[model samples]
Target: DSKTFLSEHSLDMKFSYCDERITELMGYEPEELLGRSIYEYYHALDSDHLTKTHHDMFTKGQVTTGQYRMLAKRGGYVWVETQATVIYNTKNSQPQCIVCVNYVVS
Candidate 1:
C-alpha cells in the first residue's frame, strides 16, 4: 500500500492515517498523498476548527483528540474519532508532521 493508492481509493473511502503504512495497507504510492494538504480534502464546514486543532497540535506541539467530520475522498462526509500528535525532528528540533489516526464511527 502507498499514498497513491490511498489517495486514489480515498477518493471514495475512509482512511486511518497519513503515514506510508496506511498507504501500504491500502495499496497506494507515496506520491499520491504527497504535497496535498489535508485542508484540500477536508469538508469546508470543518475547515476552521479542524485547521485550528491541527495547527495547535503541529505548531504548538499539543495533543488533539476529538470527534469530527472529514470529507471522504469520494464525495461524502463521515464521523470520525481523531487523535493527533506532533512529532519533532530530532535533527532540527522542529515539528515534523502531525500524525493522525481516524476511526470511523458508524
Candidate 2:
C-alpha cells in the first residue's frame, strides 16, 4: 500500500534503509534518515512502549506495534503500526538487523 514502507535498521537501532514511501508517510527522504536512530522518530509519549518493543525484538524475535505515533519531518506525528522482525547472523545466531514493515494508519 502507498501508506506503507519497508525499513531496515542496524542492531544499534539506527536506520540503515527505508523505501521511498517513507517520504509520503513521514515526510522524510530515505537518505535523510539513514544512520539516524529510529527512536528519534517516535513520539515522546510512546517512550515506554518503544522501550518495550526494543526488548521484545531480542526476546520474541518479532513484534507488531498495535498503534503508535511517529514524528513527521513536517512537524506533526502520524499514526502508524509496524511489524518488526529480527534478522539473525548466520554464524553466531545473534541479531544482525531488524526489518520493519510500517503501515500509516491515517
Candidate 3:
C-alpha cells in the first residue's frame, strides 16, 4: 500500500495532505502541494473526466478511473488509476474531505 499515494482534500479540492511517495513518483514535495488544487498537476486533457468523477464521487458516493494522467515533475506524464470518494467529518453531515487512492501506472 505504501506505493499507493494517498491524499486528503477539502470539498473545494484544496490539498490538506499529500504523501511523500508523490516526490518519488511525481517530483512534487508534499509541501508544494499542500493547499493547492491537485488539478494543478492533472493533465489538461483529462480534466473533463476528473471533473465529472469529482462530481459523481461527492454526489453519488465514489468513482473508479483509469483515464487520469498527471504531469511528472521532471518531465513527461504518468498514468494513474484513482479511487476517489467523499468523506464526512465526525459530524457525519459535515463535509470533511475527499481521499484519493492513486496507483501509478507503469
Candidate 4:
C-alpha cells in the first residue's frame, strides 16, 4: 500500500538520480531515471550551482539544507524546502550520495 502510494505520488515529483536504495525509498524502478540528472529532471535554473553543491557534499562531507525551486513532473515549478545529509562508505572512507528529504510549500 505504502509503496504503491509513493510510486504514484513520485510520478509527479522530480528526482535527480535513481539507484537501488533511492528506488526502494521512492518506490521507483532504476530504469525510470536511467538518463536523467536531477537538474535535468528538475531545477534547470539552479542546475549548475546545485550540481556544484552536490559534488561538494560528496567531496567535503558536508550536509546542506535550503529552499529551492524544483520542476514538478506535472510541467511546472514549485518551491520546496530540502534537507540533505551525506552518507559515507565507512570501509572506503569516501562520500556517497546524499540522502535528501523535501517538502513542498505554498
Instruction: State the lDDT of candidate 3 residue by residue for 37-79, as single tens digits.
Output: 8788788999888888887777777778666788887878988
lDDT, each prediction: 0.52, 0.90, 0.83, 0.49
Pairs clashing within candidate 3: none
lDDT, candidate 2, 6-77, per-residue tens: 999998789999999999777899999999998988888887887888788799999987788988999699
Structure candidate 1, residue pairs in collision: 1-23, 1-24, 1-27, 2-23, 2-28, 3-29, 4-29, 5-28, 11-73, 11-74
| lDDT-based ranking | 2, 3, 1, 4
Residue 88's lDDT within candidate 1 is: 69
Candidate 4 Cα misplacement greater than 4 A, ranges: 1-31
RMSD of 2: 1.0
Best by lDDT: 2
| Candidate 2 minimal-lDDT segment of 10 residues | 47-56
> Could you tell me how far off, in angstroms, the CA of residue 105 lies in candidate 2 after the best superposition?
0.4
lDDT of 4 by residue, 1-106 (tens): 2111111112112444443543433434666755455555456666666666666655565545355676544546666555556666799966544556555552
Global local distance difference test of model 4: 0.49
lDDT of 1: 0.52
* Location of the lowest summed lDDT over 10 successive residues in candidate 3: 87-96
